[PDB]
Amino acid sequence: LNIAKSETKVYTGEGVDSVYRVPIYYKLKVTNDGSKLTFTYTVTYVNPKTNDLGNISSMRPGYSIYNSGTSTQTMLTLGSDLGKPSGVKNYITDKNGRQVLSYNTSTMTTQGSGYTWGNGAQMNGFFAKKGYGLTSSWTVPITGTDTSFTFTPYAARTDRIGINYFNGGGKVVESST
């Protein structure tokens, strides 16, 4: 009878930055308000469990990472009753998730069985070392019952896009078929 107006899940996972041999993390927040899903995806060196930045004091200021692959990998697959994703806003967030500055909005394209985006933003080392994250957000219309999706996190240094620091592992899978 009294159904929730919205439901939000937060997922986190972790990989390894190959260059500095430190953990790197992601957070994916997904809110369903009945009309759309809102996705907020952050890659950061701050452990979301503790809000403590790992020791990256030796990271060079001009080192830089992407949070999205090319058609190096599908990032997002969507169930049958989800529409076309919006533009993907990109921005730097501080340790508490507050926006620091905004970058170009990316456009999602297919495929293969899903979507990726281009004009992908990046985060330089001097921001990473302040505990900042590289954050992308988008919405997806809900058109029916099958609101399943899978999301595959990605992070790579900008001169080696073929090496995903999350190594295809911590995939987010939401049912139901």
Residue numbers in the entry: 202 to 378
Paper text:
The pneumococcal serine-rich repeat protein (PsrP) is an important lung-specific virulence factor that is present in 60% of strains capable of causing pneumonia in children. Pneumococcal PsrP promotes both biofilm formation through self-oligomerization and adherence to keratin 10 (KRT10)-expressing lung epithelial cells. In this study, the crystal structure of the KRT10-binding region of PsrP (BR187–385) was determined, revealing a novel fold distantly related to CnaA subdomains. While one face of the compressed, two-sided barrel of BR187–385 is created by an extended β-sheet that presents a highly basic binding groove, extensive well-ordered loop regions distort the other face of the barrel, forming a paperclip-like substructure.
BR187–385 crystallized in two crystal forms of the space groups P43212 and P4122, with differing unit cell parameters. The native P4122 dataset that diffracted to 2.0 Å was solved using BR187–385 from P43212 as a template for molecular replacement (MR). A single BR187–385 molecule was found in the P4122 asymmetric unit, and a model comprising residues L203–S378 was refined to R- and Rfree-values of 17.7% and 20.1%, respectively. The structural deviation between the P4122-BR187–385 monomer and each of the three P43212-BR187–385 molecules was minimal, with root mean square deviations (r.m.s.d.) of 0.6 Å and less than 0.4 Å, following superposition of the P4122 monomer on the P43212 chains A and B/C, respectively. Crystal packing analysis revealed that two symmetry-related molecules in the P4122 crystal formed an intermolecular β-sheet resulting in an interface area of 585 Å2. However, a single population with a sedimentation coefficient of 1.85 S corresponding to a monomer with a hydrodynamic radius of 25 Å was clearly assessed using analytical ultracentrifugation (AUC). We believe, at the present stage, that the formed pseudo-complexes are probably owing to crystal packing. The overall three-dimensional structure of BR187–385, composed of 43% β-strands, 2% α-helices, 17% turns and 38% loop regions, can be described as a compressed barrel with two remarkably different faces. Furthermore, inspection of the electrostatic surface of BR187–385 revealed the presence of a highly basic groove with a solvent-accessible surface area of 180 Å2 that could easily accommodate the elongated and negatively charged helical rod domain of KRT10. A substructure within this region takes a paperclip form with back- and front-loops formed by residues 268–295 and 305–324, respectively, which provides a possible explanation to previous experimental observations.
